[PDB]
């Protein structure tokens, strides 16, 4: 054999994730998509109580 011209090794291949950050759907992330409706319902109920 001759001398090695191109050395190499063992690496790790992954799925390479991208910046998959959506828009409006990322806003209502941290609480829920259903607690807000109960919040609005209690809001209009307390306004009915005040009126």
């Amino acid at each position: 054999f001759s001398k090695p011209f191109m050395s190499l090794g063992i690496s790790i291949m992954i799925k390479k994730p991208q910046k998959s950050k959506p828009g409006v759907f990322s806003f209502l992330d941290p609480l829920a998509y259903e607690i807000w409706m109960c919040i609005v319902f209690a809001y209009i109920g307390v306004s009915v109580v005040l009126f």
């Binding site: 109960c38 319902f41 209690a42 109920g45 009915v48």
Partner: protein
């Protein structure tokens, strides 16, 4: 005069009908081990077509109290019975309104029944811990119509009170 009263009456009738439809079926949707609908009494899968009462209350004491409240739907059934009583009171006060003070108590009981229905909706949402049913949205729409009907009822009551105060002077 009577047009707003008829609008309040048909709004209470539509809210009672949507509350009846919310009691009936298709209140929620849950993917079991395929999706399956439920109406707070029994569950029906999408084998496919079989229906059974899946409201089994067993498998701190506050968890057992919350389970006892969520069992048998104690809040929304009594809320619907209170809405029926308020509708009967509004129907009795619509014809031959002798006393001008029963409408205020009927509206107060109607608003308290709406608040109890909202509390029962909060209990039914808290006991769920995937999609939702259409009768839950129908019950929410009946809650909105009941809030607007209570606003219109107390508006007609303060109009009648201002008319009585103007005629009494």
């Amino acid at each position: 005069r009577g047009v707003q009263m008829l609008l309040t009456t048909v709004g209470a009738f539509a809210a009672f009908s949507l509350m009846t439809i919310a009691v009936g079926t298709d209140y929620w949707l849950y993917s079991r081990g395929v999706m399956t609908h439920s109406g707070l009494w029994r569950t029906c899968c999408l084998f496919k077509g079989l229906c059974k009462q899946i409201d089994h209350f067993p498998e701190d004491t506050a968890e057992y109290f919350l389970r006892a409240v969520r069992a048998s739907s104690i809040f929304p059934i009594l809320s619907v019975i209170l809405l029926f009583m308020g509708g009967l009171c509004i129907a009795a006060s619509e014809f031959y309104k002798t006393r001008h003070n029963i409408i205020l108590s009927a509206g107060i009981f109607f608003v308290s029944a709406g608040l109890s229905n909202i509390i029962g909706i909060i209990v039914y949402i808290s006991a769920n811990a995937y999609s939702y049913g259409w009768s839950f949205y129908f019950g929410a729409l009946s809650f909105i119509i009941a809030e607007m009907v209570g606003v219109l009822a107390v508006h007609m009551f303060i109009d009648r009170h201002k008319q009585l105060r103007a005629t009494a002077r």
